[PDB]
Enzyme design. Structure first.
Site, PDB file in Angstrom:
ATOM      1  N   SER E  26     -11.383 -19.335  -8.393  1.00 56.21           N
ATOM      2  CA  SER E  26     -12.302 -19.694  -7.325  1.00 56.21           C
ATOM      3  C   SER E  26     -11.504 -20.316  -6.195  1.00 56.21           C
ATOM      4  O   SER E  26     -10.796 -21.303  -6.405  1.00 56.21           O
ATOM      5  CB  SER E  26     -13.366 -20.674  -7.808  1.00 56.21           C
ATOM      6  OG  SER E  26     -12.872 -22.000  -7.817  1.00 56.21           O
ATOM      7  N   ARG E  27     -11.628 -19.745  -5.000  1.00 51.54           N
ATOM      8  CA  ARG E  27     -10.903 -20.270  -3.855  1.00 51.54           C
ATOM      9  C   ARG E  27     -11.508 -21.572  -3.350  1.00 51.54           C
ATOM     10  O   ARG E  27     -10.839 -22.308  -2.617  1.00 51.54           O
ATOM     11  CB  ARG E  27     -10.866 -19.222  -2.746  1.00 51.54           C
ATOM     12  CG  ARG E  27     -10.072 -17.984  -3.108  1.00 51.54           C
ATOM     13  CD  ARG E  27     -10.171 -16.926  -2.037  1.00 51.54           C
ATOM     14  NE  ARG E  27      -9.345 -17.234  -0.876  1.00 51.54           N
ATOM     15  CZ  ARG E  27      -8.042 -16.985  -0.793  1.00 51.54           C
ATOM     16  NH1 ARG E  27      -7.402 -16.419  -1.806  1.00 51.54           N
ATOM     17  NH2 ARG E  27      -7.375 -17.302   0.309  1.00 51.54           N
TER      18      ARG E  27
END
Ligand SMILES: Nc1ncnc2c1ncn2[C@@H]1O[C@H](COP(=O)(O)OP(=O)(O)OP(=O)(O)O)[C@@H](O)[C@H]1O
Ligand SMILES: Nc1ncnc2c1ncn2[C@@H]1O[C@H](COP(=O)(O)OP(=O)(O)O)[C@@H](O)[C@H]1O
Ligand SMILES: [Mg+2]
Ligand SMILES: [Mg+2]
Lengths: 464, 49, 47, 503, 50, 135, 350, 49, 119
Positions: E26-27
């Protein structure tokens, strides 16, 4: 009255003719190009009828300089090549023009290159073995005198070396008359061959037809037919036995594809023409040894990207009696002539023809090499030491058998300096029988490279 | 198909027949060629639909 | 100690095999996609 | 009567663009245009008339196709696809159309030559029996190039291909300074798809080395349209052929020929031709062969000229079994595979001595090198396999160890720095040092220095070695004894970077 | 922004849900987690990688 | 001459088109000069279309569901709005088809507003950084 | 003189013009979309001439709501973007229209995005090293002045921190300015970047051009040329060294391939446009040093299926001179700026 | 698109929404069908551009 | 459907083999005038197959037990036809050649086969 050009797309040219004077298929037409130093007379071959008195033709020469509206005259006959005993000793192109002597052959008898293959009733299968003096060939892929032989392989694995070697093995002593069709191979090799056949004095007994790579596809596909016409003339009229070398026959199908894409026909698989099998068959079935006469043909087949599944080689496999298959991997091992023993095949390798002593040894060798090729997947990771003794004893002599199939060919003398070697069949059978039974398992592998016979094996081993 | 017809005649006349096709991949290739010359749009692997 | 040496050799051989297999598989991926696209576009250009 | 009526009825041309898209155009009119005629458009742009239909002409646009639009007038040049040519091109950088791109000035062209002129036939050619010295020890020793030969320089990204070919071009200066055209090789460097900065760097390197007196550059940089990339090899060969048929000796470098394949792929797919393998059109073979068969050595009945080709091909991850690599390998007379796995370790030029081959062989190698070096190839191959084995041998016989050290010192001998071409008179000595075993007492880490110093020793004193080699092309015993004496005398004066002397 | 990969081999081996925690990313990251979760899960990814 | 052609063309209040082609879920409708891309077209059998393609000769309209009822010659009326769906709080707990029509049969839906399906997204200047969990 | 829309097919529009007034290709045309809920002024880029005065164009904005027969007005120039010092500190779309303050920059000098690279005579004959001032970069993987540096990484490996650092570096050590080309970027990530560069106060020296994913491929394709045009103006007229960030170039290639398919051009190999190499060159060859000034570039480059033989990375990596890879295994140790010294490489290290 | 449209009304009024798309691969397949039926030009994997 | 709706007597519907349906559709596609999609099926595949599959459903109070056999071209479980069919099914007894070659018969792949009622 005559026709006019109305479309040009590369070498393909559409010509319109008067209502009732349309030429038949495969008729030859002449057109003029007059720009300058590019000027020349173009020969076009009729490939299709488009309706409304319009026909589509394949140009045998580059169309550069051809302007629309120029007149085109019908010869009323197919492309004609010279035939006769005087053909021997000289070099020709696809159109019957002699290169060594421009005017030569204009006065000879002329035959159409387009002809129907011999009647089925006049066919008979051949079984007489041909002894070439190469260990792997004579053992596992015995050639047929009067049959069809082929050499497959990718780029840079030994087409030319082995082809001129086979020329030395057969044509140097063959009592008959030879024809050499260079179909889309490099021109430098053609010059080298024209020089070599004169050095060896064989030239006077062989005819050469060349269609090298520079030529457009239209003639690049018809060169084979041009030479095959002379071969089958020597077959049917003179009654002599003939050798018909062709290199490379894949370029015939490639030129077929090039011209196909221009004719407008839809592509097949990866991009070859439809009727690929039909064109190749119409070409190959003409090369056959009818009853009472023989035409021995050795062909070279290119294989792009070493993809032996490519439709063209897969198609040409069906017409051949003997198929030597080269491989990249065997070439990397330093083995030469680099024949793949497990892929190559010959139809006469059966006990009724070659005898029990030959067959048993060939099949035992194949079994050993097959077990080796199955263990390779482990050999590559864990080495030989992991194998059980029944497998290790086998692999130890499998490597030796594989390397012993190599030979110091006569043609390679010009690169390695080592002289060439010829071995008789019986000595090869004896050597491989001894090898499979283990009478030489105590010698090191490096002793076996590029030897020849058994006495040379001993001589080499003594030096190590 | 002609082989199958020569067979079916004997078959329906009460005989027992054996037909060997050697080989049908060549028939698929010929049908591909014919269909492509008639300009039918080919399906998968260039074979006729 | 010889087990150490031979297993290091086997690990290196497996690494090189993984490399070659990955290269061949990527070439097959590209060839498959190209052949599929050529087939689709030949079907389109037929109509 | 009908004929006269037909004649009575029958009793500077300019066309118009009806359609234009992405580097191709369709033109109305021009009933009298020749196929592959070089048309010209108002914007100062040229085109090649490939397809001539019943109603319109298909023209591939060369250069800035942006300047073309519907309704523009198009006019004939009256010339089949051709380039200007002459001696005046020596020292100039030109685009595929023969126009100057360097801004150095106009071109005093002699004549014009068409690109589609057929190669010389079997009967016109001669055997490759004449040495094209490259100056790279790893090449002239094991894979000699003859004049009229085609030698592929196939390799991976960033492996010194352009460097090797620039060295080959630079080495010819020692010959250019002689006025006799039989030695006076001249060169052409065709740049396809290279970065502009790389072409500028090559230009600079050749100027600094004096190579620009005799080198012509044809630049089809990546920025220009596909058509320029497609023509660049053909116009380079056209510039070369004019010298070739006049009896000159020519050297053509193609850097790199795979991008011409890509440009022709683009052009073909824009014309909507059905693609084949690897999306390439079915006639890429007739592209590269039509280009490379032009290279030959002519028979003395036609002028004894020749043209040598060094095509470069970039291989995806060293997969030499790809389509274009195998197609060009099937055309050229050999290849010198530059392996990246060796380049990063420091073996430079990274010639793979195992896969490299010269299918002409020792026919074009001078007798001195032929005797001194002819053993080196197989010795290095067996050394490489011996090393692959001994890498995990806990112990091994002394003979294997000695062969291993000899091989390591030969490998260290073969490498040389960039832009440092060695004359053959020096290469034979450099390889003598190794093959005859005089290096058996120098540590590896110093070998490359040792050789480079000794060639200067023999250069200042005992010049009769290089002169005796050069003037007879064979290494006579009366010179070999003085060579050995000089070697042994120098060994006492030389010293390593660390440790003892070298005996 | 973030990819959660579900793989059948892990599903059969017993890891259900089959999140391949070693490849899912997840960025956005910790910004979406409450502080109580950062105080704990910080070392979790390193522990599972080791 | 142009005047007479223009008079005849204009003599042809809102426009109505005609299906010239139909098949496999698509219909080509001739006419409708003023149609717009992705407009809802309503055919005589009650079925709807989207008008996803606009050629020189005829509109290409994908048909939502009841394709069988289409025939050549049928009058095609146009709705004056691009694809729109009802919205509101009444959707909570309901099952709806892509057009906002109830498919669960619990009853009608008390629509509160209507929104186009293809409205502009919130731009760079309108947004805020994500800092709240979706547990 | 005005044209008419005659065909609409997705983002593709065909426009018929009077016989004599056919626009030059790559010219920008303006059209109207009048439906209230979708009111727009639509920008169309001329792609081809089809004959009969028909012109094939691709839309820079959604075509929804577009009506046949609507007026199209030619601008007489290519897509043009504003250049000047005032461009610093603001966010633009590919068409040069500001997003931070609508209507800003209208009075500025406008430059065509489609302009040719430097002439052969102007190029620097040799590669000069760039002394950026970071130990790992200068030593292990030196950067080239006017060259291209590929950048690998993602979240949690210090990428945006590196971006801010290189901006500060160029603005303080060389007196230059930065340009950031968000080619196919996430809108959320673009707002994050805008707020981060504002918080660090480096924005005053950075020009932002975001071509969002929300918009059709033509814009995702031309955004890179717009940013490079602003960089060219800063190079030539203001005489400043410039650092151009491209994130991500693979989406430039992808947008090119998609536009190629919409135009009906036959695909090449694994599925990119036929003009792939030339279309990438017309961008990369433009990033170079001339007459004493340089445009350095940092290019984030995706690799599909992590094979470096795919035509997209195979084409991209031919043009670029350095490679910097950020590693989480280095970041977790506290090693900033996390540059992996062994995976990273450079071709000027000679 | 209609799910997102239903969500956006809650979103702009100050609500928090969660949208699950199950699954977009069949959205892509349906759009591919619609496009190919309209004779739009296909690309990779037969999907439109 | 008659037995289901008009009588209510529960019924077993067997279909062998339901891939030939979409196969014939693909055979007629290019002649009808549809452009071919992926590996060579008709573009309508998903909806053409759904219009059939959705009819086999068991409405409340009146059951149909459906057992349908599906062919997998080239043993390629990725082929669009099986990949589309998989969604319409509660239980899938996926056979595989790899198991059949080991002599395991009926040769069901224990790992790929799945059922929704295994809760
Ligand atoms: N003789 C040499 N010795 C050591 N390194 C070299 C030598 N020649 C070139 N190199 C290295 O390679 C670089 C230049 O290589 P070159 O330009 O020849 O590669 P290339 O094969 O042309 O790649 P490309 O075609 O992509 O430009 C140099 O900067 C240097 O690092
Ligand atoms: N026994 C051998 N020893 C050494 N080299 C060999 C041997 N056999 C073949 N070769 C090499 O292989 C090459 C064969 O090339 P060729 O068969 O003409 O390839 P292609 O036909 O694909 O162009 C020759 O140049 C030769 O040097
Ligand atoms: Mg050969
Ligand atoms: Mg280079």
């Amino acid at each position: 009255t005559a026709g006019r050009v109305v479309r040009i797309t590369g070498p393909v040219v559409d010509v319109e003719f008067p209502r009732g004077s349309v030429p038949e298929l495969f008729n030859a037409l002449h057109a003029e190009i007059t720009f300058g130093a590019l000027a020349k007379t173009l020969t076009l071959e009729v490939a299709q009828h488009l309706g409304d008195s319009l026909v589509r033709c394949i140009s045998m020469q580059p169309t550069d300089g051809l302007v629309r509206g120029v007149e085109v005259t019908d010869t009323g006959a197919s492309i004609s090549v010279p035939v006769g005993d005087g053909v021997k000793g000289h070099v020709f192109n696809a159109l019957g023009d002699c290169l060594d002597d421009p005017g030569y052959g204009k006065d000879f008898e002329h035959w159409s290159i387009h002809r129907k293959p011999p009647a089925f009733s006049d066919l008979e299968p051949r079984t007489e073995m041909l002894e070439t003096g190469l260990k792997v060939v004579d053992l596992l892929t015995p050639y047929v005198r009067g049959g069809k032989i082929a050499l497959f392989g990718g780029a840079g694995v030994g087409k030319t070396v082995l082809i001129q070697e086979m020329i030395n093995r057969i044509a140097r002593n063959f009592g008959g008359t030879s024809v050499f069709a260079g179909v889309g191979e490099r021109t430098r090799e053609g010059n080298d061959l024209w020089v070599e056949l004169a050095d060896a004095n064989v030239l006077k007994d062989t005819a050469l037809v060349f269609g090298q790579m520079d030529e457009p596809p239209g003639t690049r596909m018809r060169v084979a037919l041009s030479a095959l016409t002379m071969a089958e003339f020597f077959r049917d009229e003179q009654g002599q036995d003939v050798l018909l070398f062709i290199d490379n026959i894949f370029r015939f199908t490639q030129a077929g594809s090039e011209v196909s894409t221009l004719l407008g026909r839809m592509p097949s698989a990866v991009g070859y023409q439809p009727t690929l099998a039909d064109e190749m068959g119409e070409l190959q079935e003409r090369i056959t040894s009818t009853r009472g006469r023989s035409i021995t043909s050795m062909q070279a087949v290119y294989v792009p990207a070493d993809d032996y599944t490519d439709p063209a080689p897969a198609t040409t496999f069906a017409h051949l009696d003997a198929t030597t298959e080269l491989s990249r991997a065997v070439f990397s091992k330093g083995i030469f002539p680099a024949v793949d023993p497990l892929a190559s095949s010959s139809t006469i390798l059966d006990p009724a023809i070659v005898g029990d002593e030959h067959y048993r040894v060939a099949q035992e060798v194949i079994r050993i090499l097959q077990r080796y090729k199955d263990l390779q997947d482990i050999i590559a990771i864990l080495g030989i030491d992991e194998l059980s003794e029944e497998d290790k004893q086998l692999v130890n002599r499998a490597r030796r058998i594989e390397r012993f199939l190599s030979q110091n060919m006569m043609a390679a003398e010009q690169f390695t300096g080592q002289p060439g070697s010829t071995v008789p069949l019986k000595e090869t059978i004896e050597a491989f029988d001894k090898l499979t039974k283990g009478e030489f398992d105590h010698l090191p592998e490096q002793a076996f490279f590029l030897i020849g016979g058994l006495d040379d094996l001993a001589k080499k081993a003594e030096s190590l | 198909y002609t082989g199958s017809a020569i067979g079916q005649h004997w078959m329906y006349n009460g005989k027992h027949v054996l037909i060997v096709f050697d080989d049908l991949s060549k028939q698929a290739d010929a049908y591909r060629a014919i269909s492509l010359l008639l300009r039918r749009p080919p399906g998968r692997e260039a074979f006729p639909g | 100690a010889s087990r150490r040496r031979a297993m290091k050799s086997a690990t290196d051989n497996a690494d090189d095999l993984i490399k070659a297999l990955t290269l061949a598989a990527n070439r097959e991926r590209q060839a498959q996609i190209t052949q599929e696209i050529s087939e689709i576009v030949g079907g389109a250009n037929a109509l | 009567x009908x004929x006269x009526x037909x004649x009575x009825x029958x009793x500077e041309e300019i066309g118009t663009v009806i359609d234009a898209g992405d580097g191709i155009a369709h033109v109305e009119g021009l009933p009298s245009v020749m196929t592959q005629e070089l048309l010209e458009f108002p914007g100062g742009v040229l085109g090649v008339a490939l397809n001539l239909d019943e109603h319109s002409v298909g023209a591939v646009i060369l250069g800035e196709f942006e300047k073309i639009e519907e309704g523009q007038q198009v006019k004939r040049t009256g010339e089949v696809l051709s380039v200007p040519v002459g001696d005046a091109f020596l020292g100039r950088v030109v685009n595929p159309l023969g126009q100057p791109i360097d801004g150095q000035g106009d071109i005093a062209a002699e004549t014009r030559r068409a690109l589609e002129l057929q190669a010389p036939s079997v009967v016109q050619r001669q055997s490759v029996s004449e040495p094209l010295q490259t100056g790279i020890k790893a090449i002239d020793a094991m894979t000699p190039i003859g004049r009229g030969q085609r030698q592929l320089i196939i390799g991976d990204r960033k492996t010194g291909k352009t460097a090797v070919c620039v060295d080959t071009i630079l080495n010819q200066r020692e010959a250019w300074l002689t006025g006799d055209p039989k030695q006076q090789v001249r060169c052409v460097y065709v740049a396809i798809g290279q970065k502009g900065t790389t072409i500028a760097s090559v230009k600079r390197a050749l100027e600094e080395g004096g190579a620009m007196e005799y080198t012509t550059i044809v630049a089809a940089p990546a920025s220009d349209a596909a058509g320029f990339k497609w023509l660049a090899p053909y116009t380079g060969s056209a510039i070369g052929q004019h010298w070739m048929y006049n009896g000159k000796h020519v050297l053509i470098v193609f850097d790199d020929l795979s991008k011409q394949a890509d440009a022709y792929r683009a052009i073909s797919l824009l014309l909507r031709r059905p693609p084949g393998r690897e999306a390439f059109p079915g006639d890429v073979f007739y592209l590269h062969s039509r280009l490379l068969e032009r290279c030959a050595k002519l028979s003395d009945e036609l002028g004894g000229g020749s043209m040598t080709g060094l095509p470069i091909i970039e291989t995806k991850a060293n997969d030499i079994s790809a389509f274009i690599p195998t197609n060009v390998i099937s055309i050229t007379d050999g290849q010198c595979f530059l392996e990246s796995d060796l380049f990063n370790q420091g073996v430079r030029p990274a010639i793979n001595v195992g896969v490299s081959v010269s299918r002409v062989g020792g026919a074009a190698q001078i007798k001195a090198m032929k005797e001194v070096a002819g053993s080196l190839r197989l010795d290095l191959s067996q050394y490489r396999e011996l090393e692959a084995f001994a890498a995990f041998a806990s112990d091994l016989d002394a003979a294997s160890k000695a062969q291993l050290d000899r091989g390591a010192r030969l490998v260290e001998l073969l490498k040389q720095p960039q832009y440092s071409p060695l004359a053959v008179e020096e290469q034979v000595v450099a390889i003598f040092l190794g093959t005859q075993g005089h290096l058996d007492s120098v540590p590896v880490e110093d070998v490359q220095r040792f050789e480079s110093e000794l060639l200067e020793h023999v250069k200042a004193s005992h010049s009769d070695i290089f002169d005796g080699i050069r003037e007879t092309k064979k290494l006579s015993e009366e010179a070999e004894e003085k060579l050995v004496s000089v070697i042994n005398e120098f060994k006492k004066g030389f010293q390593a970077s660390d440790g003892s002397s070298v005996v | 922004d973030g990819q959660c990969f579900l793989e059948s081999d892990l599903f059969n081996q017993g890891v259900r849900p089959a999140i391949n925690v070693g490849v899912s990313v997840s960025r956005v990251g910790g910004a979406a987690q409450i502080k109580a979760m950062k105080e704990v899960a910080g070392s979790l990814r390193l522990d599972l990688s080791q | 001459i142009e005047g007479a052609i223009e008079d005849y063309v204009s003599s042809f209040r809102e426009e109505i088109g005609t299906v010239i082609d139909a098949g496999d879920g698509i219909a080509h409708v001739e006419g409708l000069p003023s149609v717009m891309t992705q407009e809802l077209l309503e055919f005589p059998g009650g079925v709807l279309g989207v008008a996803l393609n606009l050629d020189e000769h005829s509109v290409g309209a994908v048909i939502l569901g009841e394709f069988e009822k289409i025939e050549e010659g049928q009058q095609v009326k146009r709705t004056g709005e691009v694809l729109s769906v009802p919205v509101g709080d009444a959707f909570l707990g309901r099952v709806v088809n892509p057009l906002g029509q109830p498919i669960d049969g619990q009853g009608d839906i008390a629509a509160e507003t209507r929104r186009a399906l293809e409205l502009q997204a919130p731009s760079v200047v309108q947004r805020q950084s994500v800092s709240e969990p979706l547990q």
